[PDB]
Write a protein that binds this ligand. Structure first.
Ligand SMILES: [Ca+2]
Ligand SMILES: [Ca+2]
Ligand SMILES: [Ca+2]
Ligand SMILES: [Ca+2]
Ligand SMILES: [Ca+2]
Ligand SMILES: [Ca+2]
Ligand SMILES: [Ca+2]
Ligand SMILES: [Ca+2]
Ligand SMILES: [Ca+2]
Ligand SMILES: [Ca+2]
Ligand SMILES: [Ca+2]
Ligand SMILES: [Ca+2]
Ligand SMILES: [Ca+2]
Ligand SMILES: [Ca+2]
Ligand SMILES: [Ca+2]
Ligand SMILES: [Ca+2]
Lengths: 117, 115, 117, 114
């Protein structure tokens, strides 16, 4: 399978850009204890992001309850890099939000200020 | 340095009794991604339990939102060993539950299976 | 882009997902507790340092210390370090060079062989 | 039952104080892949500390050979909190060091920074 390689590469990417900088501590702390389930529309699978203080875990399977579920095609997910693009994708129907919309809004705010040094 | 030793001793106790047995897997999985903030009434301090697949983190301070908040004096907290004791503690007023009562019900069911 | 920080993080993610999740791999993992395996990727002329603990494996890009076992091979031969029945042939062929404690790479390959991908 | 609770409580304490701060990264990296066996002299028990990048593992038992072994009574072991403290305990005879003394020196330097 290619899913174990996709979840590991996404985990690597999110942690390198969102969890390395001390400037991103406040944006990361808004996501503390949150689970963001992403339902990939093209493929039959989901990606589950679990947010901690020092890391984000990106899982293929999760027996728990998610605080926010986002349903979209693989192609639209890289566009979730700011609040302006998130409002447009919801409006266009491209992205469906379930649960606490503030989880995905705080994710996109953290992603908007992604940096590595 | 009293509180850091209490949170570490509680974390040690919870993981040794609740996270070691493979028989407790189903009870543990009902607590996955849940946060249980305990407000210790006597000492006016809190203990925050965060539940994962392989462990429970016990923290002195937590900046997030809790799924369930239990308010009681330190003396009543060790009595959360089964569902019969929980129902009595709530009824007597000794224990106060806020949020999702199912988080504390699944905690005492997991604690009942430990010993 | 920082491919090395992303590569070490993606490798760390996979090794932990496949080798550190199953309770069947507990004994194989325990043979590696306290060991450091340095891998020199011949094509890229960069190294990966694996540090083995009880509950996890840490993957570092740089380390100024001395590793218990250093394995030198090209990126393409490294996925072949999954068959315990082949590691002896790998070494004989010259494809993989072992320095230090050969029992570290033998126990890594045996742990990797037990895992299901 | 007592020992699994002691090793787990010590593991919890060491990780909370030594493995949380990014300022302790360099001190932690000197301990990478090292095993420090601690022989508690009062109780007939040992604690084995295994140092990684992101955590310390505290084990009750281990069949391997440790990089360093420290032998002392439970009462003197909380005094291993700085480099001047360790030099005094060795001098006085209160603490016995076996193996690589640099493992315990780097542990006490990491503990001093906390
Ligand atoms: Ca697509
Ligand atoms: Ca939650
Ligand atoms: Ca309080
Ligand atoms: Ca508090
Ligand atoms: Ca809050
Ligand atoms: Ca009380
Ligand atoms: Ca009962
Ligand atoms: Ca019972
Ligand atoms: Ca070693
Ligand atoms: Ca095989
Ligand atoms: Ca196999
Ligand atoms: Ca003894
Ligand atoms: Ca012993
Ligand atoms: Ca442990
Ligand atoms: Ca000093
Ligand atoms: Ca100090």
């Amino acid at each position: 399978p290619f899913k174990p390689l996709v979840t590991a590469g996404i985990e690597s990417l999110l942690n390198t850009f969102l969890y390395r900088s001390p400037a991103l501590k406040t944006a990361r702390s808004r996501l503390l204890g949150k689970v963001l389930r992403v339902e990939v529309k093209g493929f039959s699978t989901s990606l589950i992001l679990v947010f901690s203080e020092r890391q984000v875990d990106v899982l293929g399977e999760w027996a728990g309850d998610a605080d926010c579920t986002v349903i979209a095609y693989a192609s639209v997910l890289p566009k979730l890099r700011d609040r302006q693009q998130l409002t447009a994708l919801i409006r266009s129907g491209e992205l469906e939000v379930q649960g606490d919309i503030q989880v995905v809004q705080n994710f996109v705010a953290l992603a908007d200020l992604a940096e590595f040094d």
